Every structure is written in structure tokens, then in C-alpha cells.
Amino acid sequence: HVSVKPAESAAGSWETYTMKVPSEKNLPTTKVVLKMPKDVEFQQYEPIPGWKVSTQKHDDKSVSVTWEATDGGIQEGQFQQFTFVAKNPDKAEEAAWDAYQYYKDGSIVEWTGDEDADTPHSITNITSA
Ligand SMILES: [Cu+2]
Numbered sequence: 001h002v003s004v005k006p007a008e009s010a011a012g013s014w015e016t017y018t019m020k021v022p023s024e025k026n027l028p029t030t031k032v033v034l035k036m037p038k039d040v041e042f043q044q045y046e047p048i049p050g051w052k053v054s055t056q057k058h059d060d061k062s063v064s065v066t067w068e069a070t071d072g073g074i075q076e077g078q079f080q081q082f083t084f085v086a087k088n089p090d091k092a093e094e095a096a097w098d099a100y101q102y103y104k105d106g107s108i109v110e111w112t113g114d115e116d117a118d119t120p121h122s123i124t125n126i127t128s129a
Contacts, residue, residue: 001020001022001111001119001120001122002019002020002021002022002032002034002097002099002101002109002111002122003019003020003097003122004017004018004019004020004034004097004099004122004124005017005018005020005122005124006124007122007123007124007125008124008125008127009088009095009124009125009126010088010126010127010128010129011088011089011090011091011092011126011127011128011129012087012088012089012090013087013088013129014043014085014086014087014088015085015086015087015088016083016084016085017083017084017085017086017124018081018082018083019032019034019081019082019083019084019097019099020079020080020081021067021074021079021080021081021082021099021101022074022078022079023074023075023076023077023078023079024109025076025103025107026076027076027103027104027105028069028072028073028074028075028076028103028104029069029073029074029080029101029102029103029104030068030069030073030102030103030104031066031067031068031069031073031101031102032066032067032082032099032100032101032102033064033065033066033067033099033100033102034064034065034066034067034097034098034099034100035062035064035097035098035099036062036063036064036065036086037093037095037096037097037098037124038062038089038093038095039089039091039093040086040087040088040089040095040126041063041086041087041089042055042063042065042084042086043084043085043086043087044084044085045065045082045083045084045085046082046083046084048080048082049071050069050070050071050072050073051067051068051069051070051080051082052067052068052070053065053066053067053068054066054068065084067082073104088126089126092126092127092128093126094123094125094126095123095124095125095126096121096122096123097111097121097122097123097124098110098111098112098121099111099112099121099122100112
């Protein structure tokens with residue numbers, strides 16, 4: 001499960017988020033793509049050895065962040081935490097973190113389902129402090 005924490009954050013604030021990516025197959029995870037939630041504005045990422053970070057501007061004036069493995073990636077029995085800063089929207093909302101986990105064999109696990117699904121997205125509730 002690719003999760004993003006904290007699960008609660010203040011509206012309008014610049015929040016430090018942490019994405020946790022655990023290995024769930026017997027082969028390396030080589031790429032993670034995270035969609036920014038609606039009205040959540042990506043700002044900065046924390047560099048990490050063995051990974052390079054890039055941003056993509058979707059056709060809808062939205063942003064994804066790609067963590068690409070420059071070394072071997074997340075091996076079996078490993079997990080990695082990625083930290084970044086994003087500006088929360090000023091209006092309260094349920095922010096969903098659609099994440100896509102790329103394995104070396106070409107398989108992609110889509111952590112995009114509802115909170116009850118087998119592969120759910122994690123959710124941050126953004127409310128006024
Ligand atoms: Cu899982």
C-alpha cells in the first residue's frame with residue numbers, strides 16, 4: 001500500500017507529506033508516480049540518494065511527481081519513504097492520493113481505488129485549523 005501521511009492537515013498550510021512505498025512482490029520497484037490531489041499544489045521535494053524526481057503538468061493544470069530509481073530501486077523486503085511539501089487548498093476537502101507503483105517486470109500496481117478496495121488510495125482530510 002502506497003500511503004501518504006499525515007492523514008489530517010490544515011487548509012491553506014504548506015504541509016510536509018511523506019509517501020511510503022513498500023515492496024509487495026519478489027522484484028524491484030523502479031518507479032513511483034503520484035498524482036497531486038485536486039487543488040493540492042506541489043511545491044518541493046526532499047532529495048534522496050538512488051532516486052531522481054521530476055514533475056509533470058497534466059492537461060488539466062494539475063501535477064504528478066515521478067520518483068525514478070537511479071540505483072536498483074526498492075528491493076524485495078524493502079520499503080522507501082519519500083518526503084515532499086505541498087500547499088493545501090483553502091477550502092476543506094477529502095484529498096485522495098492516487099499513486100502508481102512500477103515494478104521491474106512491467107507490472108503497475110494502481111493505488112487508486114476507494115478506501116475499501118484491494119488497492120486503495122490513501123486520503124488526507126484537509127480542514128480549517
Ligand atoms: Cu499494500
